[PDB]
């Protein structure tokens, strides 16, 4: 079997270098071409550029040629792709995949790099809840807004799991440079306020976990 | 013989391959000049 | 630099029928073409290899053909698994130029959407600045307006949108948008509300809100 | 296999106007294209030949034209024998590929429809199976929506639609459908009913039927 | 004879943001392309030679861009002496095909139309023919249609209409339709009307007039 | 500075000939070519033909061909187009531009032919002013309309240019071979009729000036 491993995520500032690992295994090296694709969230994907391990040649294209750079290592079984003046536009998911036919016949696991100059910040939650002076009508969604937090993204639990069916977990947009996210969940007002809902967001690095009543 | 650089500019700097020949094309008009240097062998230039 | 054009970007059919996609170039590829499909989180997976051919591990199901600058992708019957984004890619010159895209959906009938607006939270003014929400569940299809109105006005920029895809079980969607900005413009009025139009029905849902309530 | 697209299906001019039907392909044809009437149930008649010159016995008022990959078909002006469907032929190259094909009608005002559902006979049960039928008249445009829903569903396939084009008297369409099926799905349910979507007006007519009336 | 199609012919952006102008030809060009800039009543004037380089004179914000058979016109940011009527040439063989032509107009909120129909003159008598007028103001955006009916007709030709463009003030739009004929078809009915069908409300205003009165 | 100097508008019968000037300045005349560029109203623009004055060889188009012929002196630093066999789809605006790296880089002023068989006649003003039976609103819009005037076009100026803002001036379209014009402008019936607006059209050509009251 021929199998791709990438390395994991990456997350520095603007104006720095970033070296990328792709290492094929079950497979001569050094006898196929070893590509590269770019895939900008969520609608873009274009072809990057090629490397031939045997004799180190690289073929470019346009907009990347000055920004990437490719080398590969024959002892290792690796290539490397290197960038140069990374900014917020460079940041998307990055594939490795290999020539044979022409075509891309096996791809890689992916990998994500951001790019920003923000820092670890813990996340705020703000309750939502109805309602004053508005009973309408017996049936409310619920949830609770998340602001505030790098890197994306947290989980938020209702009641330790209790319903996941009627919850949807919406995806986060970057605003003045944080994520925000939002939570909602419809319950009846017969059987509320009788339990208490608690939304709680877990962030693994800043280890920040918050919990709220309503 | 021996290679000529007849297109030498400051923005080729980066790039010294694009030195080694100049570009030719269709043209719209009658008689543009494509290209001049000096005959000097010792002169600094394209001779050098 | 070939251009190689993927339309419609979306189209939906339900379960056991049949779909057509056409990824059509500028020049002639002599035939060289590549289908992908991608999970959303997953990596692509190759399908057609030049046009025609099959690969090994790929159901029969999917069949593609093709003649000169039109080449489509039929698969038949449509199943769960195979809801995906595809893609198709031109082999032929450098640089190599991937399709457009299309991404699948199942077809449903219309439903109703529900507008409920939302009051900030009374701690939420400790932090320095006020964000006014109004949430949207259970609606369809995709394409839709969100209307801001305070005193007849519109404001951008500064909406945003969070679009929710669908998913296995209730094949539905969900939308929620808002806005952040400093303290003294809030109380500068009072009612509050927004609203959804939609194509099948001129006159929308109406959710208010008041804060002296 | 030269490909050569002939769009739209459908357009609609009224008499003493002109027409224009473009006929496009996908190479450079040298000028060679042959342009056909047919009447329903008739063969084909040949008007131009080599998008320019006339035949002998055909009118002067078919005046084709073009240039490079489009080509027109000028028609002035339009009388009540000039209204078939027309082809354009490519003889350039082999095989000659056959035009998609145009079918003209007389266009006029917008008409309501008559929805009437009609109960099965007392003695079709004996056959060993019921279809139930609501037949429509007076209507325009061709595009229509037929409509089946009991409590609140949709039923496919096994539904039919048979068209009737235009005559020269009133210039009216017609349409029918139903379904067969066993006996036992007949009585699951009571009340029958059927409608048909236009554009125009969101709020169509509605017939229903009840069995024990 | 080389067709070099501009589409469309109005689209519409507000000040501020940018706008897009796509110029496609049949053949390839050669990348010789020459974008113009022509006011109403004035001459054109050239903005962008050969699809990129930029003339002297002109300032940055108008950026071409392009390749192969597809040129786009990048204009941003948008403001009031930048509002004209945008062109395209083709210079590489003769003759040279110039491009349809791309109207920029401001874009704005929907705005309800005033429907007052007129008496003719008693003195207008005289001249031995007579006009029935009712002139609109104040509306958007430019696609409406014109209704004249009398005893549940429709009558053309004969009619007219005068549009007028906008200006810079209110960014607002007028009408005017009338009809000339003889002397005894005026009186030959009582009421006179007129309306003007828009997309986003079925049912439009009515202003009615009466002879009698 | 190079400079484009065309003619003035001309007005002739069908079946005639007419000859437009354009002379340039401040360049060398017999070096570069001059072009010629038809646009008819409002939709309609195509290229005509260009002469090159050293020699005197013309280029014409497929369908001008015949109708036009393209002359030159070299002593007056002049170009001339003449025009045969005008007819009515023959009057529209011409151009007069010069070709350089095969773009148009200066155009002309602009010249208006028109070609009629009408001849000049004094404009008749009908009033029109709500009205009788009808009160209906408190806001209506007044104006009048004028008809039979040759050629276009003609001013309407109200109470001496009072008030320019409501009013709107629209466009004249050829009626049974003359040109027709409408006025529109809003006042409210609080003040009307205690003020007695006018319409005046002026027209230099008939020196008729008619003024109306209401």
């Known amino acids: 079997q021929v199998q791709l491993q990438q390395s994991g995520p990456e997350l520095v500032k603007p104006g720095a270098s970033v070296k990328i690992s792709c290492k094929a295994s079950?497979?001569?090296?050094?006898?196929?071409?070893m590509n590269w694709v770019i895939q900008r969230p969520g609608q873009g994907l274009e072809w990057i550029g090629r490397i031939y391990p045997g004799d180190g040649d690289t073929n470019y294209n346009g907009k990347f040629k000055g920004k990437a750079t490719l080398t590969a290592d024959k002892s290792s079984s690796t290539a490397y792709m290197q960038l140069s003046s990374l900014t917020s536009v460079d940041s998307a998911v990055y594939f490795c995949?290999?020539?044979?036919?022409?075509?891309?016949?096996?791809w890689g696991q992916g990998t994500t790099l951001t790019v920003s100059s923000a820092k670890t910040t813990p996340p705020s939650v703000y309750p939502l809840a109805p309602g004053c002076g508005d009973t309408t009508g017996s049936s409310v969604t619920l949830g609770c807004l998340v602001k505030g937090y790098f890197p994306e993204s947290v989980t938020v639990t209702w009641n330790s799991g209790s319903l996941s069916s009627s919850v949807h977990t919406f995806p986060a947009l970057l605003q003045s440079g944080l994520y925000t996210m939002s939570s909602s969940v419809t319950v009846p007002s017969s059987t509320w306020p009788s339990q208490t809902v608690t939304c709680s967001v877990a962030h693994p690095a800043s280890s920040t976990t918050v919990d709220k009543k309503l | 013989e021996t290679i000529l650089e007849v297109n030498n500019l400051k923005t080729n700097e980066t790039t010294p391959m694009q030195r080694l020949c100049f570009p030719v094309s269709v043209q719209s008009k009658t008689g543009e000049l494509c290209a001049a240097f000096r005959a000097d062998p010792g002169r600094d230039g394209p001779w050098q | 630099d070939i251009q190689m054009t993927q339309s419609s970007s979306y189209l939906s059919v339900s379960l056991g029928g049949r779909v057509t996609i056409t990824c059509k170039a500028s020049?002639?590829?002599?035939?060289?073409l590549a289908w992908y499909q991608q999970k959303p989180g997953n990596a692509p997976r190759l399908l057609i290899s030049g046009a025609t051919s099959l690969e090994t591990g790929v159901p029969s199901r999917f069949s593609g053909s093709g003649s000169g600058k039109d080449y489509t992708l039929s698969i038949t019957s449509l199943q769960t698994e195979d809801v995906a984004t595809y893609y198709c890619?031109?082999?032929?010159?450098?640089?190599?130029?991937f399709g457009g895209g299309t991404k699948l959906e199942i077809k449903r009938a219309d439903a109703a959407p529900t507008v409920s607006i939302f009051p900030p939270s009374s701690e939420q003014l400790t932090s320095g600045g006020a964000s006014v929400v109004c949430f949207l569940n259970n609606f369809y299809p995709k394409d839709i307006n969100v209307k801001w109105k305070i005193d007849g006005s519109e404001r951008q920029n500064g909406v945003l949108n969070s679009w929710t895809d669908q998913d296995s079980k209730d094949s539905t969607y969900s939308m929620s948008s808002t806005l952040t900005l400093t303290k003294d413009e809030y109380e500068r009025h009072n009612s509050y509300t927004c609203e959804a139009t939609h194509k099948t029905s001129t006159s929308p849902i109406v959710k208010s809100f008041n804060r002296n309530e | 296999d030269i490909q050569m697209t002939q769009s739209s299906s459908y357009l609609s001019v009224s008499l003493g106007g002109r027409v224009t039907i473009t006929c496009?392909?996908?190479?450079?044809?040298?000028?060679?294209?042959?342009?056909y009437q047919q009447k329903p149930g008739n063969a084909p008649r040949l008007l131009i030949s080599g998008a320019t010159s006339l035949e002998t016995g055909v009118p002067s008022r078919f005046s084709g034209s073009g240039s490079g990959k489009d080509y027109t078909l000028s028609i002035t002006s339009l009388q009540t024998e000039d209204v078939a469907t027309?082809?354009?032929?490519?003889?350039?190259?082999?095989?000659?590929?056959?035009?998609?094909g145009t079918k003209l009608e007389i266009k006029r005002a917008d008409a309501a429809p008559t929805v009437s559902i009609f109960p099965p006979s007392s003695e079709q049960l004996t056959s060993g199976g019921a279809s139930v039928v609501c037949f429509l008249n007076n209507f325009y445009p061709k595009d229509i929506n037929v409509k089946w829903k009991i409590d609140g569903s949709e039923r496919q396939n096994g539904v039919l639609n048979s068209w009737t084009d235009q005559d020269s008297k009133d210039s009216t369409y017609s349409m029918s459908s139903t379904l067969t099926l066993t006996k036992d799905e007949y009585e699951r349910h009571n009340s029958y009913t059927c409608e048909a979507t236009h554009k125009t007006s969101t709020s169509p007519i509605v017939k229903s039927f009840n069995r024990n009336e | 004879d080389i067709q070099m199609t501009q589409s469309s012919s109005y689209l519409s952006v507000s000040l501020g943001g940018r706008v897009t102008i796509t110029c496609?030809?049949?053949?390839?060009?050669?990348?010789?392309?020459?974008?113009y800039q022509q006011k109403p009543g004035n001459a054109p004037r050239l903005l962008i030679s050969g699809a990129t380089s930029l003339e002297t004179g002109v300032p940055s914000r108008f950026s071409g861009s392009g390749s192969g058979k597809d040129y786009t016109l990048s204009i941003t940011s948008l403001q009031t002496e930048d509002v004209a009527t945008?062109?395209?040439?083709?210079?590489?063989?003769?003759?040279?095909?110039?491009?349809?032509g791309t109207k920029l107009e401001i874009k704005r909120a929907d705005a309800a139309p005033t429907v007052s129909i007129f008496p003719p003159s008693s003195e207008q008598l005289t001249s031995g023919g007579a006009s029935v007028v009712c002139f609109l103001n104040n509306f958007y955006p430019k696609d409406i249609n014109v209704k004249w009916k009398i005893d549940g007709s429709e009558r053309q030709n004969g009619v007219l209409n005068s549009w007028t463009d906008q200006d810079s003030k209110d960014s607002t739009y007028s009408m005017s339709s009338t009809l000339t004929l003889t002397k005894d078809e005026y009186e030959r009915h009582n009421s006179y009307t007129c309306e003007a069908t828009h997309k986003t409300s079925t049912s439009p205003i009515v202003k009615s007039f009466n002879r009698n009165e | 500075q190079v400079q484009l100097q065309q003619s003035g508008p001309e007005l002739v019968k069908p079946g005639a000939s007419v000859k437009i000037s354009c002379?340039?300045?401040?360049?060398?005349?017999?070096?570069?070519?001059?072009?010629?560029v038809i646009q008819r109203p409002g939709q309609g623009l195509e290229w005509i033909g260009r002469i090159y004055p050293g020699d005197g060889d013309t280029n014409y188009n497929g369908k001008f061909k015949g109708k036009a012929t393209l002359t030159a002196d070299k002593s007056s630093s002049t170009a001339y187009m003449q025009l045969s066999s005008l007819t009515s789809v023959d009057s529209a605006v011409?151009?007069?531009?010069?070709?350089?790296?095969?773009?148009?880089?200066?155009?002309?002023?602009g010249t208006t032919l028109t070609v009629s068989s009408a001849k000049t006649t004094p404009p008749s003003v009908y009033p029109l002013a709500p009205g009788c039976g009808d009160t209906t609103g408190s806001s209506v819009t007044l104006g009048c309309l004028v008809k039979g005037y040759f050629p276009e076009s003609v001013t309407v100026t109200w109470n001496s240019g009072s008030l320019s803002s409501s009013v709107h001036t629209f466009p004249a379209l050829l009626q049974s071979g003359l040109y027709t014009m409408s006025s529109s402008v809003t006042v409210p019936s609080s003040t009307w009729p205690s003020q007695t607006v006018t319409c005046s059209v002026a027209h230099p050509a008939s020196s008729t000036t008619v003024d109306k009251k209401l």
């Open positions: 890619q031109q082999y032929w010159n450098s640089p190599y130029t």
């Open positions: 995949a290999r020539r044979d036919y022409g075509y891309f016949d096996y």
């Open positions: 020049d002639h590829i002599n035939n060289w």
């Open positions: 079950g497979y001569a090296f050094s006898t196929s071409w």
